[PDB]
Design a protein around this nucleic acid. Structure first.
Ligand SMILES: Nc1ncnc2c1ncn2[C@@H]1O[C@H](CSCC[C@H](N)C(=O)O)[C@@H](O)[C@H]1O
Ligand SMILES: [Ca+2]
Lengths: 475, 916, 162, 270
DNA sequence: CTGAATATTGTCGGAACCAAGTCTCCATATGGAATTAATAA
């Protein structure tokens, strides 16, 4: 670790004589400028707002804010008072709500390292409330200047005055009033104020433009299968809502081969009767599967030494392996070569939540390193003449592969719901001719490729802002 | 103003000698001039003055003490701190020699408990001052209050011989020494503690009140639990053992026979704690012979109430002191609030216990939903109406008896109170109803014969017994031994022991069957891993007693308990319904039972103890003829399957592989191979492949047809490795064929939320999908509610009138005063002016609320009932407004049983499901 | 430490604290048995079984309990004969003899003495207490035991040897 | 209490107890060389021992387990005994624990502080902890602390009145009273001079600012007015400290005696 | 009659945390893969 040495005196600093390792790591002897909280920002005391009980207002927790300072408020009304959001209304009535004064820079107290600093810009509308866990810190040297000086830089020191204290990492306003902000940062940043705000505004306008057309990685897979099989999107999520499935004794045996009479099995059978009313392409998967393996999941150490191992997090809704291993093992099995992925395989996911079970992926990346897949995967070697593995993975990640594996997979612990070879072999998927396939794929491929192309531009301008701030504050 | 104040005033007006009088109408008190008074007592300042007046009257009249010797409100200025405190004593009774004999301090009945700590400054110091400044002898220090008993009031007091304990420290070292309880006439009282020696003029207590019980629970939790060592459950089990000993000192105690559960304060010193320990362990050892009916005499020994190391003896002495004077059994005459000791031990469980993973109970909403889904109310009503009896519920695996306490509540409340209109008199049924429950003093006496829950844990067994007893029942028919044992192993002590008989059953492995229990409700453990020697002892009464899946045995056990048509409601895991390793136990349920309802409960029900998925299964039991019909169908279709498998494997041998015919495999198979007939072959293959056959393969020829369906043929031809109980016939083929002939609907449903969301911080309401509460009661005492509102508005009006008189007096004072005091006077006038305007606004608001109350009661309830237009409680306004305002106080927390509208799981499972 | 749980718990059954103070007494009796027996003698801490099937559990109780009362007279130094005569290894009402049989049969082969130098750095009873006892009970009492590496670091950083 | 420990063997070293003049006439066994333990963080004490700790411990009012046991260490150790314990991070960082922090600072001689990872105790509680490695001071080393504690506390008490009278006069207009002090009224009449500046810099020795050395008198009274009431509020439980505000006093106390102690952090325990 | 009481309310501090979200590593039968003695032949 570190062999830091300090001298009693030091712990004299700050009105709590504290001597935890982090604070004393942040102290250091200083020779340069000091400043204080005086010639900069100013803490604002909290207050109870006058909520109007006639219109839908907004509210914002700490989880509703992101590391990029983008609040995602929820809309409450005081005419609903539903027991699902009753906690929010109760904490509002308690007095855990305030309203920023259009120019302050709210800072989260709990765990301040996750950049929850947000800006309430001057020229704006649709006033949003906030939790007392946020610190109104309204500045005197222009909000944007202090916001950008706090987000990227002045972060190794706001995070070094947190109270660990047998639990939550937490920031306190009193400690926040003690940081030793250098002047060269603010001096240089205000010196270039007239153009820094301009080009940063241009960059964030481009980011907003990219975000305006950004689409989720699952809806794309959800729409093409919905727009190609001519199934309306507003009934299979409305038929899945009603829960009064009624079956007879005779229907239990039909295609069961294990006599399973759970409720979810019967609802799966009901939904299958709806997803295939007009589609005439369904063929049993059992006759298109040639083998099935599981994998090898030894004990693993995170960021250790040995052969890397994949996890369930590496399977995404696009049928492409993430191939970004984290765990690494050092055990042997005398047959390790049987589980070293290799390009071209199809990996369905066995073991996950009731909604993330069955997600398949094709290893489309060329890797010269041997990477083991766990017992939580199932490798499918299908005939590459009728199924087109990528299409099968996309189908498994589609609502076809969700409304089935959500209701057929087994286990008493529905937090680690697992599938088995029986459900794979007894799966009546719709397989259209090879002409129809490679059209759903390809369309989905280009749409997701475009969505990924505008996913690094966002984290290119969001990095350009940071590097520009760093360069200007260092010149 | 309590009722005992009225009784005291009536007794004072009834006294021949007018030595003490009170007036509640004027709030005044008067005493005879014979008593030397150091202060003018002419107003009733509170309950203390009334109690003091009654005490003085009792001393003069009943206790025969000279009023001249009595002294009231004598000043006893002492040196307290930097200044001189001026305390005053209430009552001083002096002997013929002038020395104070009784040093009585008067306190309110509620003040009699939390003000004991002030006794050090109220009794001992003042007595020391009396002895010092007057050279007199103080004999007895009395901390006294009134105690209502029948149409009379007696003295509930702690009396301390001041000579024995001149200091408060000596009093506290002996554990709150009390030489006497009730005042004795003619300078009496013994040195030894007056023993209870019940079954006479004196007893433990029969008129216990809610406030006393709440304070007892508070102080018991404060003292016993503490924070030092042991645990939070060990203390609970020790307290349960002590309560069991207390009940033992009510079952085996005849007339006279001084109670063994008390301090036995001989002389002036508390009897040695070891004597108390020994004479309580004797009670507890005698308790494990009729209460928990333990037969092994060596197990009776080497077993104690407390560890003596986890539970110090002083805590046991304090527990005895607190609980000695409270008759748990048979004492519930607080029936103005009905049963009062059940919620006491419910609060004991809730406040002190540490339910964790493996100790948690079954949530009450699920238990109530199960009991209602069985239609147990209608079952009990019809069981009592036709042939006078009740259902005879059993709950194996009943750790805390939640399925049995709730069953008691559900049967009593809905056979006497709610649905009593569905019980036909017909003379005999009235007599049986009177016998089962009616005196209102023992409403659960019927549950001494119809509740046969079991439990394997000794501690939880005793806790369930105490639960059962404190609710007005006897726990004789609850067994603290294993629930999976030969039926002869369950002996109670009494004659009716339904869970003892056994008999072989031809249709069930020639094994024991107790076909006597009406319904079975249970929550079996999710993972039973039996001992290597307990496993071997159970492979003689269960068909699948060797599958290493012991938790399924309970399901099989449920077949040995029901009575050919017995309702069965179980909280099973979803492995039973989903995983393949349990297929056998799914066939069993489909063979003997008549599966009728399946409900999928969320993964939040048993949180934060486990996120294990659960499903409620509601299955009946087939009669003796349905099982044999199933057996006949199974045998016939299995014979068909065997013939088809022989024909199909002969076909497969001839084709693909290729045989030059053979030695006449069978007459049928070798009659067309030479003749080339294919229709018979086609139909035979279709029958043997009744499931894996498509419509496009009809035209396909045999040679490749036997190749297309080749794995299926090699699989559907396999028999069951184990559970030959079926007879080598393939389960799937024969099961489908049987289900095709006999078929019944199976109601299935899902629950999104169960009302509650418990977590490691507390509970939290959620939208219940299982059931809806009544909110608006079917019956409401309208005159009681109107009188309560009239009383509160009259009290506020009296306060307004008093403050208006004060305002008039202050105005009169202001009219003839000068500025120097007029400043303060006008300050008072403005204070009272805004105070009275606020009171007027409050009165107007309460009047509006009252008017809305008459409006709603006349619109809905009418003559202290609820009109049938809203018996379904479908109207949002009524239930919403009852869940609001002052009507929230009365309310109603009862599961609504709708009959016409169905938007709930329970409301439709009680209508679509039909029980045979 | 893992399989001696859900067999002793037994799907509910014996409480987690009952398991703990029964196993500690069982291990005390085992240590006594290893301390008394001399070369050539058969151990009392074992179950005599005729291949399959075991002897009467009552005779196993009156061979391990006697070891326990003989254990807290020579090493625990308890001298009050009344306490010795009133104490027992386990409570049969809260710990069936079958679980005692399973515990002994699981611990028959292990040699706690002279085996303590092989599992160096493994506090047996502490780890058993942490595993068996639930987290709620440990939280309201601070029953969180400091691991062997950390305590070793503490005692070696104080220069306690010096 | 040390008299509650009984043992019928070789002299029970955990039974002696004599009052200590430096600890406030309270029992000190004080026979052992090392104490190693992990305190029961945040556990409610028994009522019987809850009654007996108020009159036996220097901080008996603060009903907190981890700290009403950092004293037990002081009682057990000798004049030079060694200590090492796994304390919580709350002792080292939480501000609601300024008392104990100073106890440890006065009686014990901190010599090494290592911060264990949060992966310690992971399957059970996973709370951040640290190690203290303290040693008790000798008797002739605690008399030094006190004599300093007061030498720098009397100055703080005088400065409290002097600067709070400067505040009352220079801002919030108030005429001279002539009973304030024989030096504040003797110097206000002449001018700010150096006496006002010296006495206002000494009181504000911590916050201060170098660039504030040259500016008008009515500037260094309003910017610091929010914290003039912070270093002039003194410290609760005066019985153990002495009616001072601590931080200031402490500040110099330490500055006159310096310990070059060792600190470290582990990220992987092993 | 000045008082700074105590006596509450209502609100900062702080938690051997722990509610949400979602990834796992390991026992254990099985079943098949090896025999076997069978099994006709
Ligand atoms: N034969 C047996 N085997 C294992 N546990 C049994 C058992 N018989 C009864 N039990 C006990 O029954 C309990 C079931 S958990 C259900 C608790 C209780 N029925 C309620 O509704 O609140 C377990 O704690 C277990 O200890
Ligand atoms: Ca365990």
């Amino acid at each position: 670790g570190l062999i830091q040495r300090r001298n009693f005196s030091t712990f004299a600093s700050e009105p709590s004589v504290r001597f935890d390792f982090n604070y004393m790591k942040s102290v250091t002897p200083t020779t340069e400028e000091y400043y204080t909280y005086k010639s900069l920002f100013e803490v604002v005391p909290s207050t109870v707002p006058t909520l109007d009980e006639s219109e839908p207002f907004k509210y914002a927790e700490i989880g509703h804010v992101s590391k990029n300072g983008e609040v995602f408020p929820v809309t409450l009304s005081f005419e609903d008072r539903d027991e699902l959001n009753e906690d929010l209304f109760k904490k509002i009535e308690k007095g855990d709500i305030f309203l920023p004064e259009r120019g302050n820079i709210l800072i989260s107290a709990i765990r301040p390292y996750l950049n929850k600093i947000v800006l309430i810009k001057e020229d704006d509308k649709t006033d949003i409330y906030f939790t007392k866990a946020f610190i109104q810190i309204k500045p005197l040297i222009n909000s944007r200047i202090l916001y950008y000086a706090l987000r990227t830089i002045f972060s190794e020191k706001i995070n070094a005055v947190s109270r660990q204290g047998k639990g939550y990492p937490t920031l306190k306003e009193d400690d926040l009033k003690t940081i030793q902000f250098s002047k060269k940062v603010i001096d240089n940043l205000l010196a270039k104020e007239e153009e820094l705000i301009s080009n940063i505004d241009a960059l964030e306008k481009d980011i907003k433009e990219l975000k305006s057309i950004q689409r989720s990685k699952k809806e794309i897979v959800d729409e093409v299968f919905s727009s190609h099989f001519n199934i309306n999107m507003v009934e299979l999520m409305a038929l899945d809502s009603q829960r009064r499935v009624d079956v007879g004794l005779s229907s239990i045996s039909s295609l069961n081969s294990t006599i399973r009479y759970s409720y979810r099995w019967n609802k799966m059978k009901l939904i299958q009767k709806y997803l295939y009313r007009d589609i005439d392409c369904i063929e049993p998967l059992g006759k298109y599967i040639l083998s099935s393996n599981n994998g090898w999941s030894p004990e693993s150490v995170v960021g250790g030494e040995g052969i890397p191992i994949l996890g369930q997090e590496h399977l995404e809704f696009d049928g492409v392996l993430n191939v970004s291993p984290t765990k690494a093992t050092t055990k042997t099995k005398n047959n390790m070569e049987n589980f070293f992925i290799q390009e071209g395989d199809l990996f369905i996911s066995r073991g996950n939540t009731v909604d993330l079970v069955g997600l398949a992926c094709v290893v489309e990346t060329e890797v010269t390193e041997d990477i083991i897949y766990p017992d939580l995967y199932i490798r499918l070697k299908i005939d590459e003449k009728v199924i087109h593995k990528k299409y099968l993975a996309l189908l498994f990640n589609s609502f076809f592969g969700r409304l089935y594996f959500k209701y057929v997979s087994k286990g008493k612990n529905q937090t680690m719901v697992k599938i088995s070879s029986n459900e794979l072999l007894n799966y009546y998927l719709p397989i259209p001719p090879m002409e129809e396939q490679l059209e759903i794929v390809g369309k989905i491929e280009e749409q997701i490729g475009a969505q990924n192309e505008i996913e690094k531009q966002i984290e290119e301008k969001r990095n350009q802002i940071r590097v520009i701030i760093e360069e200007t504050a260092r010149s | 103003m309590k009722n005992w104040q009225r009784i005291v005033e009536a007794k004072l007006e009834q006294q021949k000698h007018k030595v003490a009088e009170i007036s509640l109408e004027n709030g005044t008190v008067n005493y005879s001039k014979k008593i030397k008074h150091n202060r003018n007592l002419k107003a009733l300042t509170g309950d203390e003055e009334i109690v003091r007046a009654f005490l003085i009257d009792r001393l003069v009249n009943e206790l025969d003490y000279k009023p001249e010797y009595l002294e009231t409100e004598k000043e006893y200025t002492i040196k307290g701190g930097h200044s001189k405190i001026n305390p005053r004593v209430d009552v001083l009774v002096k002997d013929d020699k002038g020395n104070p004999f009784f040093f009585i301090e008067v306190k309110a009945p509620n003040k009699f408990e939390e003000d004991k700590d002030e006794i050090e400054g109220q009794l001992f110091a003042l007595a020391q001052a009396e002895e010092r400044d007057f050279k007199t002898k103080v004999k007895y220090l009395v901390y006294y209050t009134v105690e209502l008993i029948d149409d009379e009031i007696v003295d509930r007091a702690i009396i301390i011989d001041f000579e024995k304990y001149p200091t408060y420290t000596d009093w506290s070292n002996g554990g709150f020494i009390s030489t006497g309880t009730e005042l004795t006439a003619g300078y009496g009282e013994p040195k030894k503690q007056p023993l209870i020696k019940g079954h006479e003029k004196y007893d433990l207590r029969v008129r216990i009140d809610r406030e006393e019980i709440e304070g007892l629970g508070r102080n018991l939790h404060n003292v016993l639990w503490g924070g030092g060592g042991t645990n939070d459950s060990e203390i609970f089990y020790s307290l349960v053992n002590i309560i069991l000993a207390k009940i033992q000192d009510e079952y085996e105690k005849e007339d006279g026979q001084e109670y063994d559960f008390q301090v036995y304060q001989y002389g002036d010193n508390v009897e040695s704690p070891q004597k108390l320990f020994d004479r309580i362990n004797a009670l507890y050892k005698r308790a494990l012979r009729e209460q928990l009916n333990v037969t092994d005499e060596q197990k009776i020994a080497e077993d104690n109430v407390i560890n003596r190391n986890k539970f110090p003896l002083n805590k046991l002495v304090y527990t005895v002191q607190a609980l000695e004077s409270l008759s748990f059994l048979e004492g519930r005459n607080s029936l103005d609030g009905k049963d009062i000791l059940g919620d006491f031990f419910e609060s004991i469980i809730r406040d002190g216990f540490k339910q964790t993973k493996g100790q948690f109970f079954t949530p009450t909403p699920i238990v109530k939903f199960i009991l209602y889904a069985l239609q147990l109310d209608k079952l009990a009503i019809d069981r009592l109406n036709n042939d006078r009896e009740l259902p005879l519920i059993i709950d194996p695996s009943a750790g805390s008896g939640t399925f049995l306490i709730e069953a008691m509540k559900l049967i009593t409340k809905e056979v006497k109170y709610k649905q009593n209109h569905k019980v036909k008199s017909s003379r005999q049924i009235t007599k049986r109803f009177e016998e089962l429950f009616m005196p209102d003093h023992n409403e659960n006496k019927w549950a001494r014969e119809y509740l046969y829950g079991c439990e394997i844990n000794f501690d939880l067994g005793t806790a369930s017994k105490v639960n059962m007893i404190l609710h007005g029942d006897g726990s004789a028919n609850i067994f603290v031994q294993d629930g999976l044992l030969p039926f002869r192993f369950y002996v109670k002590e009494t004659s009716p022991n339904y869970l003892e008989t056994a008999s072989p059953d031809a249709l069930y492995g020639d094994k024991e069957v107790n076909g006597k229990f009406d319904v079975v409700v249970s929550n079996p453990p999710f993972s039973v891993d039996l001992d290597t020697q307990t496993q071997r002892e159970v492979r003689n009464a269960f068909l699948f007693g060797d599958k290493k899946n012991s938790e399924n045995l309970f399901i099989e056990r449920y077949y040995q308990l029901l009575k050919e048509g017995g309702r069965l409601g179980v909280v099973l895991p979803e492995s039973v319904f989903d995983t393949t390793e349990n297929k056998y136990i799914r066939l069993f349920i489909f063979k003997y039972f008549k599966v009728k309802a399946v409900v999928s409960l969320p993964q939040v029900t048993f949180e934060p103890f486990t996120s294990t998925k659960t499903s409620l299964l509601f299955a009946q039991k087939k009669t003796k003829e349905e099982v044999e019909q199933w057996n006949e169908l199974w045998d016939k279709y299995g014979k068909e399957w065997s013939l088809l498998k022989t024909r199909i494997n002969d076909y497969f041998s001839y084709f693909v592989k290729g045989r030059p015919l053979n030695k006449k495999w069978a007459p049928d198979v070798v009659k067309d191979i030479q003749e080339g007939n294919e229709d018979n072959i086609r139909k035979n293959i279709f029958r043997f492949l009744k499931d894996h056959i498509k419509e496009e393969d009809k035209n396909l020829e045999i040679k490749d047809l036997l190749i297309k369906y080749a794995e299926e043929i090699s699989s559907i031809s396999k028999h069951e490795k184990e559970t030959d109980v079926f007879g080598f016939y393939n389960a799937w083929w024969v099961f489908g064929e049987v289900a095709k002939e006999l078929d019944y609907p199976i109601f299935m449903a899902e629950a999104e939320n169960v009302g509650y969301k418990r977590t490691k911080k507390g509970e939290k309401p959620m939208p219940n999908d299982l059931y809806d509460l009544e909110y608006a009661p079917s019956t409401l005492d309208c005159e009681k509610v109107l009188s309560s509102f009239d009383i509160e508005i009259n009290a506020l009006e009296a306060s307004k009138t008093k403050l208006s008189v004060e305002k008039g007096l202050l105005e009169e004072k202001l009219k003839d005063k000068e500025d120097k005091e007029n400043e303060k006077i006008q300050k008072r006038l403005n204070k009272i002016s805004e105070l009275l305007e606020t009171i007027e606004n409050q009165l107007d608001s309460i009047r509006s609320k009252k008017l809305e109350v008459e409006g709603i009661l006349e619109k809905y309830y009418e003559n202290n009932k609820l009109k049938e237009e809203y018996s379904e409680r479908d109207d949002e306004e009524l239930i919403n407004h009852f869940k609001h305002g002052v009507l929230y106080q009365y309310r109603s927390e009862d599961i609504l049983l709708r009959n016409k509208t169905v938007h709930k799981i329970l409301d439709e499972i009680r209508q679509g499901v039909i029980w045979d």
